[PDB]
Amino acid sequence: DIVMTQSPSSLAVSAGEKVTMSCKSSQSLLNSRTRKNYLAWYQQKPGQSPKLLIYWASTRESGVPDRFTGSGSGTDFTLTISSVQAEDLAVYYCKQSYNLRTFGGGTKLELKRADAAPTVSIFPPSSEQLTSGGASVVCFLNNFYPKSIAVKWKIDGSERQNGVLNSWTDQDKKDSTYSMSSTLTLTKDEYERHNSYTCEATHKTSTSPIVKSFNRNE
Amino acid sequence: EVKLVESGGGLVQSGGSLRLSCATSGFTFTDYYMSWVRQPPGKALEWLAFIRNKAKGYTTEYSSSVKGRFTISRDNSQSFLYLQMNTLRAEDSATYYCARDINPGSDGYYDALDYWGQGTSVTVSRAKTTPPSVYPLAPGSMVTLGCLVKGYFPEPVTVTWNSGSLSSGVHTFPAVLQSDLYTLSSSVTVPSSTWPSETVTCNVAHPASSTKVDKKIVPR
Ligand SMILES: C=CCO[C@]1(C(=O)O)C[C@@H](O[C@]2(C(=O)O)C[C@@H](O)[C@@H](O)[C@@H]([C@H](O)CO[C@]3(C(=O)O)C[C@@H](O)[C@@H](O)[C@@H]([C@H](O)CO)O3)O2)[C@@H](O)[C@@H]([C@H](O)CO)O1
Ligand SMILES: [Mg+2]
Numbered sequence A: 001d002i003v004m005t006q007s008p009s010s011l012a013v014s015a016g017e018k019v020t021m022s023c024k025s026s027q028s029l030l031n032s033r034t035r036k037n038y039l040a041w042y043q044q045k046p047g048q049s050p051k052l053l054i055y056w057a058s059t060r061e062s063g064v065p066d067r068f069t070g071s072g073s074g075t076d077f078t079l080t081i082s083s084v085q086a087e088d089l090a091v092y093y094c095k096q097s098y099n100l101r102t103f104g105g106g107t108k109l110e111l112k113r114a115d116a117a118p119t120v121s122i123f124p125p126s127s128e129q130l131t132s133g134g135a136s137v138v139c140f141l142n143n144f145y146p147k148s149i150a151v152k153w154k155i156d157g158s159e160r161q162n163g164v165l166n167s168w169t170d171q172d173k174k175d176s177t178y179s180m181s182s183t184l185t186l187t188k189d190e191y192e193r194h195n196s197y198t199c200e201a202t203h204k205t206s207t208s209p210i211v212k213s214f215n216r217n218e
Numbered sequence B: 001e002v003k004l005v006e007s008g009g010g011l012v013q014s015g016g017s018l019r020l021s022c023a024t025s026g027f028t029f030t031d032y033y034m035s036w037v038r039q040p041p042g043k044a045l046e047w048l049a050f051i052r053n054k055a056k057g058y059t060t061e062y063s064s065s066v067k068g069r070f071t072i073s074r075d076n077s078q079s080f081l082y083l084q085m086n087t088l089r090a091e092d093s094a095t096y097y098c099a100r101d102i103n104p105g106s107d108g109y110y111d112a113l114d115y116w117g118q119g120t121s122v123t124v125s126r127a128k129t130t131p132p133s134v135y136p137l138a139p140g141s142m143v144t145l146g147c148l149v150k151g152y153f154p155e156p157v158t159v160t161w162n163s164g165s166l167s168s169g170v171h172t173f174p175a176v177l178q179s180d181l182y183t184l185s186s187s188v189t190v191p192s193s194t195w196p197s198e199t200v201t202c203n204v205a206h207p208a209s210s211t212k213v214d215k216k217i218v219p220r
């Protein structure tokens, strides 16, 4: 049993700043004979497979930028990123290979950027869905920051909480924003009883709700 | 070029069995140890097993989490790596990666998993396989469109736009499970001068049901 732990679990840093993350093993990973620490770092960006960054604790894989530096020895190791770039958003794992292989729990690196208001789009149910008796109403909330946001659905002016399913994207690797999708699912029967459908977004970038709506007679 | 391709993932009932494969090329297979690593949705990587190279007699090792339950093997004539999985449980639901491991007999030896496949997804569940319904999202300078991929099981589905030719300005939202069915959506933002004058189509695949859909987004 070699236990691996990492710190912090997550953090956020502005582009251009320094990032420091830590890795500990429950026993030394140092082969004193060969003077090698059996400790590697892997980078996993959203929806991608892990990628080898560092091995033997401090050797950069070919093609890895020099802003990434691994250090430490024995039981304590550090991955440092000087001048973080937007594209560096990812989970970083450390892994011992002194005794079989064990990964740490990972450190989630996110990027701080200026606040940005969400761009809100609403979409009525498709006729192809309606034909089968369902009615889903969709609102996209794109390219906002910070991640904290609330969406309220209203039907004929009254809030509807049941039947809503929300999903957030991982941070955008280009512009460091977030996006969210909110889908309200009704039956066709219920959908046809009302006229006005509205999604209201609450975000720190606006004192008033950010609202999109439609009526069933357009 | 080093290539690793996993296959064989899918839906399997609790207590059932499944065998994953990993096709390799671009290197001398028998010179290398090979590992399997898994990752449940939203969780950390977990190393599972390796099999050593020819020099070491192709011996195997396992994490305690799977030893006695999973069997790693290789076929050196067709350069495949396999993982036989038995008595599967919900905790075994995850994406499984094969990764090229070490060759300590090499002058260029270093200790790491240097190449990884795209991964193959496994879901351990008694729920039935259900194909997605795919619905267009069209509005009632720039214009945002989308596709709603609703009511499928199991994960995953893939979504592209215009066969991958539209990639920037695309957001595909992580699937959400509700009542044993997944739903996800994808938005795409393009110049208004290009839609609907140019065609915008979402391409959706659901491997578990062999579903392939093309849904053209039309004004309406
Ligand atoms: C004389 C060479 C020692 O290492 C090798 C070799 O170069 O042929 C490889 C070595 O590899 C593996 C293995 O289990 O196959 C995988 C590799 O990634 C590492 O995990 C190493 C371990 O670090 C080896 O640790 C041990 C060992 O089990 O041999 C035990 C440790 O407690 C310590 O004693 C080290 C020792 O400090 C090494 O000098 O050895 O393992 C492995 O295949 C060994 C082989 O066991 C040697 O008989 O050969
Ligand atoms: Mg009502």
Ligand SMILES: [Mg+2]
Binding pocket: A142, A143, A172, B169, B170
């Ligand atoms: Mg965007």
Ligand SMILES: [Zn+2]
Binding pocket: B059, B060, B061
């Ligand atoms: Zn052994």
